[PDB]
Amino acid sequence: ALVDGFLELERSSGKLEWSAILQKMASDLGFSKILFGLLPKDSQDYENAFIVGNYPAAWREHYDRAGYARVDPTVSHCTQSVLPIFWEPSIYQTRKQHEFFEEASAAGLVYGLTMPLHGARGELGALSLSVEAENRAEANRFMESVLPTLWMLKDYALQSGAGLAF
Amino acid sequence: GFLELERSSGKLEWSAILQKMASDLGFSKILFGLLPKDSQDYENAFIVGNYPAAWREHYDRAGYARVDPTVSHCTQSVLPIFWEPSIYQTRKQHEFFEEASAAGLVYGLTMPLHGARGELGALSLSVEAENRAEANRFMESVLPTLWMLKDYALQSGAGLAF
Ligand SMILES: Cc1ccccc1C(=O)Oc1c(Br)cc(Br)cc1CNC(=O)c1ccccc1Cl
Ligand SMILES: Cc1ccccc1C(=O)Oc1c(Br)cc(Br)cc1CNC(=O)c1ccccc1Cl
Numbered sequence: 001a002l003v004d005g006f007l008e009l010e011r012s013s014g015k016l017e018w019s020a021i022l023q024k025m026a027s028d029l030g031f032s033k034i035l036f037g038l039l040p041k042d043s044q045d046y047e048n049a050f051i052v053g054n055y056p057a058a059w060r061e062h063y064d065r066a067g068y069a070r071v072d073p074t075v076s077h078c079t080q081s082v083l084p085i086f087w088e089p090s091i092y093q094t095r096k097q098h099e100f101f102e103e104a105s106a107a108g109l110v111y112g113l114t115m116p117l118h119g120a121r122g123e124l125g126a127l128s129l130s131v132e133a134e135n136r137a138e139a140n141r142f143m144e145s146v147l148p149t150l151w152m153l154k155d156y157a158l159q160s161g162a163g164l165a166f
Numbered sequence: 167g168f169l170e171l172e173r174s175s176g177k178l179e180w181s182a183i184l185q186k187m188a189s190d191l192g193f194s195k196i197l198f199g200l201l202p203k204d205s206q207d208y209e210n211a212f213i214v215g216n217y218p219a220a221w222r223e224h225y226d227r228a229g230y231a232r233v234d235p236t237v238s239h240c241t242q243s244v245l246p247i248f249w250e251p252s253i254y255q256t257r258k259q260h261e262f263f264e265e266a267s268a269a270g271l272v273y274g275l276t277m278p279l280h281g282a283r284g285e286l287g288a289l290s291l292s293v294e295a296e297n298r299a300e301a302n303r304f305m306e307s308v309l310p311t312l313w314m315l316k317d318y319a320l321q322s323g324a325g326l327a328f
Contacts, residue, residue, distance in 0.1 A: 078282070080282050081282050082281060082317045082321055083321050116282065118244075118280045118282055119244060120242050120278065121242075147314070151313050151314045151317070152310060152313045155245060155313070156245070159243055159245050
């Protein structure tokens with residue numbers, strides 16, 4: 001129930017409740033782990049982004065410490081496009097990106113996609129969602145099956161989330 | 167049909183592809199409008215589509231971008247705005263609703279466009295129906311597809327425009 005979810009987000013109070021609702025929307029849809037990240041207009045301060053979700057804490061910590069925002073191919077994608085980027089080995093091209101892939105894989109981030117977020121007031125962000133699957137073909141099958149719902153979800157989360165972050 | 171949008175060469179072909187996509191989906195007339203980062207020069211926007219020419223000319227001449235409630239909505243939101251009578255609130259907006267309605271833009275919605283490089287825009291789509299309830303039923307039925315379509319149109323259109 002997408003619209004119901006949105007209304008729940010917009011009747012929530014504080015970051016904890018908002019994050020619980022969003023995570024449950026994603027979980028119900030069939031995704032595993034999620035990260036919603038948002039920066040205000042003109043900011044490139046990734047290490048101080050508004051971050052929501054259930055990525056493993058030690059991974060989030062590692063990412064900040066290693067300055068992976070500068071290497072993560074989804075981040076660079078988000079600066080150039082409003083279209084999703086699917087997590088495939090082909091997006092990891094540089095030597096650093098291969099290292100990144102290995103570390104993200106260890107944290108359970110193998111299959112999934114990232115939806116770039118570009119808000120009405122210049123907010124810049126991402127909604128990333130991982131998928132538990134036995135192979136790429138099955139992960140892609142699931143993602144296709146829910147892509148239209150998720151496409152609406154990312155914009156509802158952006159509109160609501162932007163008000164909470166800022 | 168985003169690959170068709172990208173395969174295309176020039177505005178004429180792009181416009182024809184987008185219009186067909188909207189028609190095939192069940193919409194009547196469409197407008198894709200786009201401005202570059204920081205611009206509020208609505209009278210010089212990049213505009214694509216099949217809105218009646220006389221209507222587009224009127225909108226520019228009356229400076230309706232100052233009163234159009236979908237324009238204000240786009241500055242504040244990434245979410246659709248359906249063309250409900252309730253959105254036209256001020257005296258000038260009532261007049262706008264009357265004139266737009268005469269142009270065949272009675273039922274429909276506008277999807278705000280916010281590009282990765284700060285582009286600001288709208289994809290507006292009108293629906294022919296016997297009443298608003300019937301139009302609203304149709305729009306809800308194709309909304310997921312449209313929601314994808316607007317982002318594909320934006321990514322491609324931004325390249326074409328700028
Ligand atoms: C805040 C922001 C703005 C614009 C674009 C991205 C972000 C953002 O939150 O980036 C981040 C930040 Br900070 C921290 C972390 Br942990 C993760 C991301 C986004 N990257 C991914 O979700 C991802 C995708 C594929 C494989 C591995 C990973 Cl880790
Ligand atoms: C360029 C732009 C940026 C941001 C938001 C909108 C635009 C844009 O193209 O606005 C315009 C411009 Br210029 C010209 C015209 Br003719 C129409 C619009 C958008 N408005 C509508 O489509 C509409 C909606 C409901 C009822 C009647 C109408 Cl006419």
